């Protein structure tokens, strides 16, 4: 079976034996002393420990192949003039088909972020949003896929005006540096310092104005757990805990021509159940129904209001506010730097395998 144009064939139909293409395989970097961690590539004790978890790595790879094919399709049609809703719905329709959506066993890990200009993250349109992608916009496309809760958190920046080319180059280089410096036993603060050092070495000129590129200090990389986008460990992107064997990380960096700090701005669109809250009995009818719709369709994965609308849900705002006030669901509003500033992002998911570091979401694009 061969892939169609536009893509419509599920990834598990292109690889029916269940063996999915590997991502970029990398040798582990040497420790702070000077001694290499490379021995793992040939360690028979690590080879057995890596082959035992083959099913897990394989689930990540199916989700990363769906991610690669979706984003290549998006890059062929994403154009100024389209509404943000049209872009998100078209990407998500393709994503559901290629991942072969199946309740909580396979699907979309989180809503399609399409944050514009000074807004760096967590903007997706709610219904009625008339926002249109502009020729001069700097759009961060951040979407996720999953197979059995193995999440691919991977993102890129879209532009149509070549004036942002050096800002894009700075963020791509800083993300690639964070990826190279990652490895088993490496301290998280050292990955951050290396990212910042590369990012700040760039100066850019946009519309007659100049800036030294700044990392967004309150945004960061993070460990990923099963059905848990952020498993608790933080990979700073500026200058105590160490990366461990078997862990999975989202290595992301954000560069800004503003203050390099993000604040909560605009209306909220992204929501996600608190992973640590157990069962809470609810009598309020609309609130109880919405919590049941959330547990059924999303569980601990993130969602957006547009995804409640497509399920036939209506009059849920107060019920959603109640779940938020109770601490059962947390809101994740858009995170924006100062007005007039520009932000860019590049993100990859990496597997800290016993034998090698796998940049599972790597493609021929980024
Ligand atoms: C930047 C910060 C506010 O993000 C988080 C903080 C804690 C836990 C999770 C996330 C998060 C991330 C991510 N850290 O990459 N991506 C997300 C997609 C979503 F749809 C939602 Cl609701 C949540 C997340
Ligand atoms: Mn992301
Ligand atoms: Mn992330």
Question: Which atom from ligand 1 is nearest to the alpha carbon of 304?
Answer: 20
Residues whose CB falls within 8 Å of the CB of residue 317, separated by 6 or more in sequence, listed in order? none
Q: What are the start-end ranges of the E strands in 305-342? A: 329-332, 335-336
Secondary structure (DSSP) of 93-154: HHHHHHHT--TTSEEEEEEEEEEETTEEE---PPTT---B--TT--EEEEEEEEETTEEEEE
242/248 Cα distance (integer angstroms):
13
CA-to-CA dists, residue 306 to 124, 213, 285, 315, angstroms: 9, 34, 21, 13
Per the annotation, does 200 bind a ligand?
no
Is there a domain that residue 24 lies in?
no
Do 66 and 173 reside in the same domain of the chain?
yes
Indicate which residue's Cα is closest to atom 2 of ligand 1: 219
CB 152 within 8 A of CB 146: yes
Domain span holding position 253: 55-259+340-362
Task: Based on the fold, state whether residues 301 and 354 are members of the same structural domain.
Answer: no
Distance CA 46, CA 40 (A): 6
Q: CB of 121 closer than 6 A to ligand 1? A: yes
Experimental method: X-ray
Q: Note the residue count of the chain.
A: 366
End-to-end CA distance of the chain: 26
Say whether 348 counts as a known binding-site residue.
Answer: no
Query: How is 243-272 classified by DSSP, letter by letter?
Result: --TT-EEEEEEEEESS-S--EE-S---EEE
In a domain, 199, yes or no: yes
d(CA 68, CA 98): 10
- Residues 222, 330 within the same domain: no
Q: Determine if residue 67 is labeled as part of a ligand binding site.
A: no
Give the residue from 161, 258, 254, 140 showing the smallest Cα distance to 207: 161
What is the Cα–Cα distance from 97 to 11, expressed in whole angstroms?
Answer: 9
Helix, strand, coil distribution of the chain in percent, nearest 5: 30, 25, 45
Cβ atoms of 157 and 252 closer than 8 Å: no
User: Under a CB-based contact definition with an 8 Å cutoff, are residues 143 and 155 in contact?
Assistant: yes
User: Are 136 and 153 part of one and the same domain?
Assistant: yes
Resolution in Å equals 2.1
Gap from CA of 144 to ligand 1 centroid (Å): 11
218 alpha carbon – ligand 2 mean position (Å): 15
Tokens 């979401």 -> residue: 361
Q: Which ligand is nearest to the CA of 302?
A: 1
Residue 128, both tokens: 């009625």
Q: What is the CB-side half-sphere exposure of residue 4 using CA atoms within 13 A? A: 9
For residues 344 and 164, the answer to whether their CB atoms sit within 8 Å is yes
Burial class (CB in 10 A: 0-12, 13-18, 19+), 256: buried
As given in the structure block, the two tokens for residue 252 are 């992301």
Is the four-CA dihedral 260, 264, 267, 270 of positive or negative sign?
Answer: positive
Looking at the domain assignment, is residue 163 inside a domain?
Answer: yes
- Close Cβ partners of 190 (under 8 Å, ≥ 6 residues apart): 32, 181
Which secondary structure element, helix H or strand E, spans residue 358, and what is its range?
A: strand 357-359
Q: How far is the CA of 140 from the centre of ligand 2 (A)?
A: 10
The alpha-carbon radius of gyration of the chain (Å, integer) is: 20
> How many Å apart are CA 360 and CA 145, to the nearest integer?
13
Among all chains, which residue has been given the structure tokens 């849920």? 316
Exposed/middle/buried for residue 151 (C-beta within 10 Å: 0-12, 13-18, 19+): buried
Q: For a substitution probing ligand 1, which of 108, 110, 153 has the most ligand atoms within 8 Å of its CB?
A: 110
Tell me: do 192 and 267 sit in the same domain: no
97 within domain boundaries? yes
Ligand 1 site-directed mutation target among 332, 335, 345, most atoms within 8 Å of CB: 332
158/112 same-domain check: yes
Tell me if 110 CB under 6 Å of ligand 1.
yes
DSSP 8-class letter at 39: G
Which residues precede chain breaks (C–N over 2.5 Å) in the chain?
239
What does each C-alpha distance from 335 to 124, 219, 343, 350 come to in angstroms?
Answer: 12, 9, 11, 24
Give the residue whose CA is nearest to atom 6 of ligand 1: 230
| DSSP assigned state of 90 | H
The reply to whether 193 sits in an annotated binding site is: no
For residues 224 and 221, give the distance between their C-alpha atoms in angstroms, rounded to a whole number: 10
**229, 269, 276, 303: which to mutate for ligand 1, most atoms within 8 A of CB?**
229
Question: What three-state secondary structure class fits 30?
Answer: coil
117 and 177 fall within a common domain? yes
Q: Is residue 138 part of a domain?
A: yes
Could you tell me which residues come within 8 angstroms of residue 281 by beta carbon, excluding any fewer than 6 positions away? none
Q: Which of 87, 71, 75 is nearest to 152 (CA)?
A: 71
**Residue 169 and residue 202 in one domain:** yes
CA 290 / ligand 1 centre spacing (Å): 21
Phi, psi of 56 (to 5 degrees): -65, -55
Residues 235 and 324 in one domain: no
Q: Helix or strand or coil: residue 293?
A: helix
Residues annotated as catalytic are 142, 153, 222, 230, 252, 347
- 308 close to ligand 1 (CB < 6 Angstrom): no
Cα atoms found within 13 Å of the Cα of residue 123, Cβ hemisphere only: 26
64 & 90 share domain: yes
296 burial level (CB within 10 Å; 0-12, 13-18, 19+): exposed
Q: Are residues 87 and 216 in the same domain?
A: yes
Q: Note whether residue 1 is domain-resident.
A: no
CB 317 within 8 A of CB 144: no
Is residue 25 included in any domain, yes or no? Answer: no
Say how far apart CA 141 and CA 58 lie, in whole Å: 25
**Cis peptide leading into residue 6 (ω within 30°):** yes
Residue 222 main-chain phi, psi, to 5 deg: -160, 155
Q: Which residues pair with 261 in a beta bridge?
A: none
Q: The tokens of 217 are what? A: 């200090």
What total number of domains does the chain contain? 2
- Residues 6 or more apart in contact with residue 232 via CB below 8 angstroms: 222, 223, 225
Q: Is 5 within a domain?
A: no
The span from the CA of 117 to the CA of 337, in Å, is 9
- CA–CA dist 235, 286 (Å, integer): 39
Question: Do residues 332 and 272 make contact, with C-beta atoms less than 8 angstroms apart?
Answer: yes
**142 annotated as a binding-site residue:** yes
Identify the residue whose C-alpha is closest to ligand 1 atom 14.
Answer: 230
**Which DSSP state fits 15?**
S
Rounded Cα–Cα distance for residues 287 and 267 (Å)? 20
CB atoms within 10 A of CB 203: 11
250 and 326 both lie in a single domain? no
DSSP H or E run through 304: strand 303-304
Atom of ligand 1 nearest to the CA of 272: 22
- Å from CA of 275 to ligand 1 middle: 12
**Strands 150-158 vs 335-336: parallel, antiparallel or unpaired:** unpaired
Instruction: Kindly state the tokens that stand for 59.
Output: 């689930």
């Amino acid at each position: 079976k061969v892939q169609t144009d536009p893509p419509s064939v599920p990834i598990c139909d292109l690889y029916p034996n269940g063996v999915f293409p590997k991502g970029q395989e990398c040798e582990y970097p040497p420790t702070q002393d000077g001694r290499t961690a490379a021995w793992r590539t040939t360690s028979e004790e690590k080879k057995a420990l890596d082959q035992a978890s083959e099913e897990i790595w394989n689930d990540f790879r199916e989700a990363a192949e769906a991610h690669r094919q979706v984003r290549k399709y998006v890059m062929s049609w994403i154009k100024p003039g389209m509404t943000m809703i049209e872009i998100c719905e078209k990407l998500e329709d393709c994503s559901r088909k290629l991942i072969k959506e199946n309740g909580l066993n396979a699907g979309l890990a989180f809503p399609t972020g399409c944050s514009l200009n000074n807004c760096a993250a967590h903007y997706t349109p709610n219904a009625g949003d008339t926002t249109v992608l502009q020729y001069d916009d700097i759009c961060k496309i951040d979407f996720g896929t999953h197979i059995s809760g193995r999440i691919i958190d991977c993102a890129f920046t879209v532009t149509f005006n070549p004036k942002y080319d050096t800002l894009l180059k700075a963020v791509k280089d800083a993300t690639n540096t964070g990826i190279k410096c990652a490895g088993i036993d490496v301290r998280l603060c050292d990955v951050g310092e290396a990212i910042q050092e590369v990012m700040e070495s760039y100066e850019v000129e946009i519309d007659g104005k100049t800036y030294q590129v700044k990392p967004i200090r309150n945004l960061n990389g993070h460990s990923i757990g099963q059905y848990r986008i952020h498993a608790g460990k933080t990979v700073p992107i500026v200058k105590a805990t160490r990366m461990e064997e078997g862990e999975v990380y989202a290595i992301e960096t954000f560069g800004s021509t503003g203050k390099g700090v993000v604040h909560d701005d605009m209306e909220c669109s992204h929501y996600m159940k608190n992973f640590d809250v157990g069962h809470v009995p609810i009598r309020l009818p609309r609130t109880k129904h919405l919590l049941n719709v959330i547990n059924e369709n999303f569980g601990t994965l993130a969602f957006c209001r547009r995804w409640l609308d497509r399920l036939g849900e209506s009059k849920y705002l107060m019920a959603l506010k109640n779940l938020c006030d109770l601490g059962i669901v947390d809101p994740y509003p858009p995170l924006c730097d100062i007005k007039g500033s520009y932000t860019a992002q590049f993100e990859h998911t990496i597997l800290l395998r016993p034998t090698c570091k796998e940049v599972v979401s790597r493609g021929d694009d980024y």
